[PDB]
Amino acid sequence: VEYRNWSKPQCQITGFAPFSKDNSIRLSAGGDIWVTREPYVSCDPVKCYQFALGQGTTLDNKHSNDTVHDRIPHRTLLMNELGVPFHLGTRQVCIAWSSSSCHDGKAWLHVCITGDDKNATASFIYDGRLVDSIGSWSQNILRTQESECVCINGTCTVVMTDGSASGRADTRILFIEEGKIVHISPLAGSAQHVEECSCYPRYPGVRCICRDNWKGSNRPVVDINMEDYSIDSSYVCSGLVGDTPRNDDRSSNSNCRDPNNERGTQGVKGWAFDNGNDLWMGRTISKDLRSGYETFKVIGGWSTPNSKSQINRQVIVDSDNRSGYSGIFSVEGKSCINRCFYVELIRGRKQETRVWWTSNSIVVFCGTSGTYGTGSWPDGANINFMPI
Amino acid sequence: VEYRNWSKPQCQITGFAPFSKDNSIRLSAGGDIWVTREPYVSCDPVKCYQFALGQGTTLDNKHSNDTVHDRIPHRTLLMNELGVPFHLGTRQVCIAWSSSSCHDGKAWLHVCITGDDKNATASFIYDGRLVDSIGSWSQNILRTQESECVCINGTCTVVMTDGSASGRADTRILFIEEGKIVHISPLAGSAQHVEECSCYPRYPGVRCICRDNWKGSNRPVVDINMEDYSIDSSYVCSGLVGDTPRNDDRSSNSNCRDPNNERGTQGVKGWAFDNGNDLWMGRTISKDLRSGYETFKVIGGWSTPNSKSQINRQVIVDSDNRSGYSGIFSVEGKSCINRCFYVELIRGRKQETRVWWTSNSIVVFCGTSGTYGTGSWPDGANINFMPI
């Protein structure tokens, strides 16, 4: 095998086409399925897999009660083929309550994180074996992307932050070759809070769109340079804006430089990705909760501040159904490289209260240069049928 | 690997021999099994698989209730090895409430269809990745074969129709190379309604036998020419006739040209396939409902209109057991290429009412140039034992 350099143009995409649904919440009411969250999907050169941090339990289990917590000693990274739900035959690739994974073209690499919030460690496992690790540098919930990392020429760059959720933090960009941390560069530029980045290649670099959980409603952009470990950060120009809580279509702004300070605190993992001076983006249709999910292209949203002229919108999940996190993922074609995205349809505690567990299921679309139609592909689980 | 051209004579078949049964409805009363329908089987060069559109649920699940619907956002295409039932480890290859699959000799290709009836999209997934897509052209339930598509020299031809179930429609024949739609030809000839074709190679072409859900009791024939995308359509000559509702053996006709207008409206997917001027065919023994299933050769049924002299009949399912859809599938031998067929034994709502779910199981026979006996291989599930 050869390492992937991802060099070949991004494919011109008309919009997205349905690609895979898993129905985990539906089946759980008739089969032992894992209780998960913060899922993501990524692919080796031959096929795609689906990851998700489980809750060290199945759904029809007493231990499911109160899984409305992001951090416990039992969350491990699950990894199945795209399409096969997380049943009991599913493998727990490592102990992790925060992860990332990518395949350098030769082998997989997972960065799994567990430990006390105050002093967690992050194991760098490469090709089966545990190759390196690192401890918390700011002693405050060392966390990573929660989606696919990216590698070019044998070097995978994952980004991680440690510090305050709603205040200054410490974002570092890691360069790991074959499981070994060959370099660490610190965040630079104008971004004011970087949590869980959705990253993709843009030869010869990697580009991220993340979550400002402190003062931003607009999304931080984080540009990595693999040539010299340089970093730069900004915000997306679109006045449309894709974080939740969001402000409002008429009343939302972004100058491409600073956290718009409009309902900035709190967030949700999401993604976006350029195209010329355009921006393909996605977001929960709601600006208060995570419900429904539409996507659209913002003409001039990658280069002109406060641009709000959209075209090509699509409803993936209807406005009155639950949405959640979401992230990009690239797949390579015979001629270019398409961008795809998944969306975590979360169920259970918080909104729903008939139950005490919290899990989710997924749905995944992929860019297409062709024609497509209309639909809404929600979780589809009658909450009254469900256990607990 | 090399692409398949399927060139080598059709094997002379004496009748069919049993090949695989799955017992899904039986096991479901003692194990988490999927709720499926519209199944089909097809094979890569080394082994055969079994497909079926699931109902985004298992049978002993509350979500099973009311799965007497062909279209919901949760139907995804399931794919297992021939013989292994659709258990929870089963992979959902894509979101689809109407599909087709074939393997060009190098990789699999699935055409999965979901969306609103009024505006559905059809994703063309090839070798793991989503390579193309298309939207509904007549805005009325864009649907496809529901059985194996066929490829020769790297080009797979799937046929699809969109329009009225019981009235004029819009049938198009798609030519896709490596997931890419390289051409679309429209239906031509005398056929008056083409739904869910059962197709097979006949180097250098592909031949289909489908369902006329409007004015035909006789079956439409659809002949594709891969050399120049030309199309032709007719009807099977046999006065025997294989659609249901069917007329009656004494009172059924077909001139090989026009929908016999005998109880034409409604139908069921089925198959048939020539041999010289003969026709190997199959059908539910009932002409009112889908019950029992016999097969036979109609001497002169491929060339002489209203020919009803049969020979070699076989009962696969006895007259007083449930039948359903059915389709062909070719497998290549050391010297020729055999034709096989499956039969969807459907259970649950509509006929049976003790329950609220609807699923099925399969059974599959294969042409044999040898000797064989007698039997009936029905679903075999005591409906009173079954959940709900």
Add this chain to the structure above:
Amino acid sequence: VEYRNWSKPQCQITGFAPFSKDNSIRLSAGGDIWVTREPYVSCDPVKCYQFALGQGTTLDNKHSNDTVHDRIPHRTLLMNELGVPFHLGTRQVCIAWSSSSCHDGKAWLHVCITGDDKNATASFIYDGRLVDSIGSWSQNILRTQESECVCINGTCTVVMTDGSASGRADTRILFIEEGKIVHISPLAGSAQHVEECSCYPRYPGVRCICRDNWKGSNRPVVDINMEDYSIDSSYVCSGLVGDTPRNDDRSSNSNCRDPNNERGTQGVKGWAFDNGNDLWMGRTISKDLRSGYETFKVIGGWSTPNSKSQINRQVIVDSDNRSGYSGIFSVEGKSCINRCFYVELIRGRKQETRVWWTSNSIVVFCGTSGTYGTGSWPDGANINFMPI
């Protein structure tokens, strides 16, 4: 790959060593497991598998009730790796209520039999595809070995009989190359009833020890000559005798030529195999029922009639636990070829009556030229814990 000729001496074996147990009946009371019977084990060149005709159902299923029948349309041949029990992920290789399987060194071959007793067909499936078939020649339960067939230089010889269980029958020896019946030779010699042979190679031939269900307590020997399809049949010399019902140690005889007429009617599949003029053999310790199972070498039992001087006995299953069928199976070593055997530990209806189902589990030993100890490895399932 190359076809196997099995040429290399039989290994000198001191006795048997434990090789694999599956615990199916135990687990069934805490997990969806198949209801099977007439199991057997065999191996491709890299690893061993376990086969068994299921009963188209799992054990904790209402459909399990009354599975005390050898013939129904739903029995299919199950095939797992040696050690993994028949769970729902298990593949049903074909429809069969009587089978055999062997691997010519290049691919597997299964001969599966189903149909009406009066007119059954036997499908010859080779390397995934259905290559041939045959109908019942005597119209009375066409049945086969129920254990591994053997191939040398690409030719697999399976034996089959059709006729009366307790009266004259019609035994034929089949020669199949790559799924194709290249020749049929009829039984010859002095054997008077041949049912379910346990066969093994003895380059350049194949040798069988079977069941005389009519007039024999002693076992028929069936010698196949691959060089010219010649056949010969006799009986084992040992006055010890290994069929059940058996007579008694003091009062049992065999002249190596004719069915000893001592409690001949009825039987059970078993095995034995020579070594010089010696005979390694196995049998239920009981001569009335199938209970317990011991093995021993009979010095001079392969060449001298009514020889009863044994040595090396071993208890595999203690006298007061259930036994059942059993058969040989050869595995090739770096220098010779060892013989192994399995034993069907059957539970449920007939003897046990707390339940209505009937299934079994297995245990398998293998010849060893080394030291060994003592034990008894019964099913071990508290019948009162078990469902139904």
Add this chain to the structure above:
Amino acid sequence: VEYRNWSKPQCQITGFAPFSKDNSIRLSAGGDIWVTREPYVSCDPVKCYQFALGQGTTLDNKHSNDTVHDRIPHRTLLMNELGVPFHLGTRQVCIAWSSSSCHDGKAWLHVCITGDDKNATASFIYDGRLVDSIGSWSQNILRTQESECVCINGTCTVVMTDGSASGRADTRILFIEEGKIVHISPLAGSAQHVEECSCYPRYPGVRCICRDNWKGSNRPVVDINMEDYSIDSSYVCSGLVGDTPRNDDRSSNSNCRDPNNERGTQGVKGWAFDNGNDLWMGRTISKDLRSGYETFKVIGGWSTPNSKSQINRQVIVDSDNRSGYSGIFSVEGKSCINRCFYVELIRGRKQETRVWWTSNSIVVFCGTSGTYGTGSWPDGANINFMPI
């Protein structure tokens, strides 16, 4: 492939990083999972597996009651990929109530032991087939390591003992090449009881740290010489000491030569491993029961008697949670070979009494030359939620 010689320096390790957790006890309350104990983990050249002697049953099974016994005819060696729990699809590699496994670089080798305590046999299975066996030499519970054996240049050396648990015994060191016992050397040196050794390579030799169940609180060291089958035995120098019952930190000693006679009787499998004159070691934090588990380096603990100056301690399991057995396991890197360890978190009967079963789950760490943090990764199963 080539046989492994393991030649390349031991990696300098800063401490351990989390590597894999399985959550078996948690899931068992919501899914059919095996009842196991005495687990271990080991790896072929591409990936790691997890082994464990099951109890011929699943946890939510009546047959689980009273599995507080180390020896019954149904314990078989289970083998899954590291991370996938022992579900019903799990393979039982052989019948065994005491085992060991290693992969010579070309194929796996398992030494499985079952039989009467008084006269057990030990099957040596190599590469699928049963290659050799041996009987009990002292007629008193022939038992082996219960963790990974090690091979260099095609020769695997497993050690086994037979005799009195709390009195003189008979320890033998076995040299097996490709499943064949090519030599047996007897224990030599000053060790006074060797049970269940944790062994690892130290080219050109193998080194073991075991359990003195008779007069030692300190651990026996067993040094094997592959060059000439020579053996030597001693005790670890650290005055810290790692057996349980242990004495006390202030009041515990070891002169590197003789069983310290401090609470020597009884024990638990554990491990340790040098580094210069240092000793990386692990142990239940309790010295009375198996609870909690910490690890630390004892400066000068490999060369100076009664050395108790520790550094780098880590809590893997907190003091008030259940611990159990534990063992080493080596994995090879691009430059050196890291040492890892697992820890059996046991639940059920003895301590816990709400239930009648006894099983466990695991957690596994691996040496790291990098940074790490803090945590405790216990079983995490609410015993009141659990079945029985």
